[PDB]
Write a protein that binds this DNA or RNA. Structure first.
Ligand code: FES
Ligand SMILES: [K+]
Ligand SMILES: [K+]
Ligand SMILES: [K+]
Ligand SMILES: [K+]
Ligand SMILES: [K+]
Ligand SMILES: [Mg+2]
Ligand SMILES: [Mg+2]
Ligand SMILES: [Mg+2]
Ligand SMILES: [Mg+2]
Ligand SMILES: [Mg+2]
Ligand SMILES: [Mg+2]
Ligand SMILES: [Mg+2]
Ligand SMILES: [Mg+2]
Ligand SMILES: [Mg+2]
Ligand SMILES: [Mg+2]
Ligand SMILES: [Mg+2]
Ligand SMILES: [Mg+2]
Ligand SMILES: [Mg+2]
Ligand SMILES: [Mg+2]
Ligand SMILES: [Mg+2]
Lengths: 170, 65, 108, 113, 50
RNA sequence: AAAGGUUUGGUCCUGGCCUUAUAAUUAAUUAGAGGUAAAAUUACACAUGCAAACCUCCAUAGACCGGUGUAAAAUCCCUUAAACAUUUACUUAAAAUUUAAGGAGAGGGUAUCAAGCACAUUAAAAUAGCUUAAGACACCUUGCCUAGCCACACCCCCACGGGACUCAGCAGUGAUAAAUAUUAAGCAAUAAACGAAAGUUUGACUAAGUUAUACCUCUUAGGGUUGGUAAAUUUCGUGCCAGCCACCGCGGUCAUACGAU
RNA sequence: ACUAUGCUUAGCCAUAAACCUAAAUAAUUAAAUUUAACAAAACUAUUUGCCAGAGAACUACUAGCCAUAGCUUAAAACUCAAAGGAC
RNA sequence: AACAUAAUUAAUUUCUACGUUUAUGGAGAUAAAAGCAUACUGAGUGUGCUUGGAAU
């Protein structure tokens, strides 16, 4: 049995379910939440369930969490311009908190698809090379082309050993 | 950490001095206390020599000017 | 251990595999120094033919000579290999039959 | 007005020391994923920051701004803001003094003092 | 063989003191001082002082 | 791992070792040829030959290719700035390639290495600070990041200087090691250098030679094993002897375990 | 028979099967749960400490210590295919 | 240690010479009522403690 409570939180599939990818402006997200209370329950679940997913998609963002420092839970984002975005998450479900932060400071689906396509621009199916980078190492693999001499011996007339002998004979 | 204003009055009235917890624990034994004492003494002497050299160097420059 | 304890310690420490009689080498060449008999641990009762050899590394070791009858003598050259002699305690080397002075058992 | 090279253009941390002149030692923490466990833990870093007015106290949360030119070997940041003062927190949501999970001044009232 | 153990103990502690003294000489010599700090005498910490 | 064998009088638990799979090297025995890939004991010492030229003088090149893993926890990824021993265009802007200063994070061992001893800040030059059990410092070992990258180039970390005075370029030699490719052909192809160019040069490379080290296509048959794990022993000899075992074990005269068959 | 000693007042020693052989906390009694067996019904969550076959070894060495045969900390070579626990 | 010459096309020289590591008694093969800690002697006994002895 995997240790801890809700061990599914420690699986790559769960971490990859996060949908909040912050804009490049976002630099820090401080989380102020209370460990005891009734109006801060959604905030506690957000730290428990969602903060791992947010960090997984935003490795360069500093997430620092503070406990029992204020009467109410809130989120404060620090942007690169110097702006500070305060969010109030009291009486808000963890799902509501995730959707709110996605709207205000989350990249849209269109933007992300463009980056994924751009990332693969230099991979070409026609390119030949190692399996790590390319589909086919050599043109011998293609159908109709001359096969590799190791797999199929070349005709005698196409071999340097044979051609050299004829030149001596001439 | 919660009410600093109350904290200040309480210590002043009750006459209690509060020292903050030290970040790092320091081990203590005869060999350490003796080596740590020399290192402080060696440093101080080196800095005293530097100060004397600076005064002599500046004094010579002042005379030339 | 707790997840915090597993994190602070990381993967379990694995001591490196100890080298054996050949010092992590397929075979070694040694010069015979003496030929003697060793008595197997009881319940085994025999007169096993062994020899002391000075290996190329420079150390001196005892090597069991397999086969029924050997012609080895002092100053001969042999190629020793790994493999412990179970009944003979301390004999972790064996002689290779058919190499250098040592020859194949003489089927008679 | 080119910005710093350092990645940490903005760092939040706690003032763990203030014994240097006009400098505050700040401990920041980030979350790092353990590859074996797939769990996040706290990796903490120490940042020296220029406290021009010596207005920092141990235990208070602060925001640091990366300096354009390193002031010294270790001082590459300045004190942008004191997010939370030690024991003197002011609730961002309501704006009223608080002492833990309680209001020193009720939000219903309007003292304006 | 306790007698030897006491003999080994008293000779081991003497080497332990010389190593302590030498380590202190290395520090000030490296710092650039040519003599130990004024009024300093390496304490004898392994002898029968208690 | 889909597991198996092995503590005992017996059962169960715990717990190690071993077996069955895969590969590399060396060795014993054995083997026809052909196609292909690879080639590897040692940063020990080296006879001999070759590996850098080009070209109307100036220059350019010999700073590359090639080789080895010496050193160093040395690195990875990322940021910023500037260049080049450069190119191409403009007489100024796109690149390739480097250098330096850095840091989100990641990065071998020993804690019987527990303290390091100036490792800090301020900028009137004062303050007493800085790193460290969230592993400093010390020591030890190690090429890693693999379309490739880093480090080294007889030694002295460097190379003014000194000295054990040069093949870690190709091919060879001695010594050493369980470890064994030709002192070979051609610049025809591609790459590099040089030239305005026809062209020239290249132990890079190309085409061969050598070798069951690997795969493919054929064709001869050899090697081992045969108590259990674990597929398979029939007659004799030996008799705790000679021998055999990866583990458990076998042999003291009806040996499925050793030797021949 | 008699002594160190057990007692007292001042200092030191830091060891016990110092064990209820049960770490400390908040749960639950249902999961159609003797989930080995014997102890003390079982099980969950949290935090720290500790363990990684056996002998070598409550050992060697290092370091700390009013201790000087001590105390705490604690290996390697080596050798084996067991050692060990409850019935 | 580091000046100066030149100058009716422009150049010249200077731009020095300590300490620290490695190495040459003990534990293991072939068989040719109890205990823990501790003190004394020799396992005997003393003091405390445990049941992993026993006692209707
Ligand atoms: S791999 Fe393509 S010709 Fe051999
Ligand atoms: K087993
Ligand atoms: K062979
Ligand atoms: K070098
Ligand atoms: K050519
Ligand atoms: K056969
Ligand atoms: Mg061979
Ligand atoms: Mg190269
Ligand atoms: Mg090396
Ligand atoms: Mg050489
Ligand atoms: Mg050199
Ligand atoms: Mg060569
Ligand atoms: Mg050369
Ligand atoms: Mg070979
Ligand atoms: Mg040629
Ligand atoms: Mg040209
Ligand atoms: Mg028979
Ligand atoms: Mg047989
Ligand atoms: Mg008396
Ligand atoms: Mg030791
Ligand atoms: Mg008790």
């Amino acid at each position: 049995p995997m240790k801890g409570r809700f061990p599914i939180r420690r699986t790559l599939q769960y971490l990859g379910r996060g949908d909040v990818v912050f804009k490049e402006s976002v630099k820090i997200m401080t989380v102020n939440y209370n460990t005891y209370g009734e109006l801060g329950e959604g905030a506690r679940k957000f730290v428990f369930f969602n903060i791992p997913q947010i960090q997984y998609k935003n490795p360069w963002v500093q997430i620092m969490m503070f406990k029992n420092m204020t009467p109410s839970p809130f989120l404060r984002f620090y942007l690169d311009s110097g702006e500070q975005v305060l969010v109030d998450v009291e009486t808000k479900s963890n799902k509501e908190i995730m959707e709110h932060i996605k709207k205000i400071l989350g990249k849209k689906e269109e933007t992300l698809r463009e980056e994924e396509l751009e990332k693969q621009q230099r991979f070409h199916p026609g390119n030949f090379g190692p399996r790590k980078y390319c589909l086919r190492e050599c043109m011998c693999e293609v159908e109709g082309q001359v096969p590799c001499p190791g797999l199929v011996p070349l005709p005698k007339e196409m071999t340097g050993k044979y051609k050299a002998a004829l030149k001596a004979s001439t | 950490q919660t009410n600093y204003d109350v904290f200040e009055k309480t210590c002043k009235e009750l006459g209690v001095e509060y020292t903050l917890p030290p970040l790092h624990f320091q081990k203590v034994h005869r060999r350490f206390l003796a080596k740590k004492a020399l290192c402080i003494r060696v440093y101080q002497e080196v800095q005293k020599l530097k100060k004397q050299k600076r005064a002599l160097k500046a004094a010579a420059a002042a005379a030339k000017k | 251990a707790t997840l915090n304890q597993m994190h602070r310690l990381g993967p379990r420490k694995e001591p490196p595999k100890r080298l054996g009689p050949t010092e992590g080498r397929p075979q070694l060449k040694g010069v015979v120094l003496r030929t003697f008999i060793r008595k197997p641990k009881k319940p085994n009762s025999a007169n096993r033919k062994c020899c002391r050899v000075r290996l190329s590394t420079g150390k001196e070791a005892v090597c069991f000579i397999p086969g029924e009858g050997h012609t080895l003598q002092e100053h001969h050259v042999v190629l020793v290999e790994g493999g412990r002699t179970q009944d003979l305690p301390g004999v972790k080397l064996k002689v290779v039959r058919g190499k250098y002075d040592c020859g194949h058992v003489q089927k008679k | 007005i080119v910005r710093s090279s350092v990645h940490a253009k903005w760092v939040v941390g706690k003032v763990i020391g203030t014994a240097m002149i006009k400098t505050a030692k700040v401990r920041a923490t980030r979350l790092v994923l353990d590859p074996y466990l797939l769990k996040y833990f706290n990796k903490r870093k120490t940042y020296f920051a220029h406290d021009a007015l010596q207005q920092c106290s141990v235990g208070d949360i602060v925001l640091l701004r990366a300096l354009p030119v390193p002031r010294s070997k270790h001082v590459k940041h300045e004190l942008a803001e004191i997010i939370f003062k030690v024991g003197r927190v002011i609730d961002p949501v309501t704006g009223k003094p608080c002492a833990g999970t309680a209001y020193l001044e009720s939000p219903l009232s309007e003292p304006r003092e | 063989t306790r007698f030897l153990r006491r003999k080994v103990r008293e000779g081991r502690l003497k080497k332990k003191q010389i190593k302590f003294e030498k380590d202190l000489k290395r520090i000030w010599l490296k710092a650039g001082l040519k003599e130990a700090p004024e009024n300093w005498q390496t304490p004898k910490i392994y002898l029968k002082n208690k």
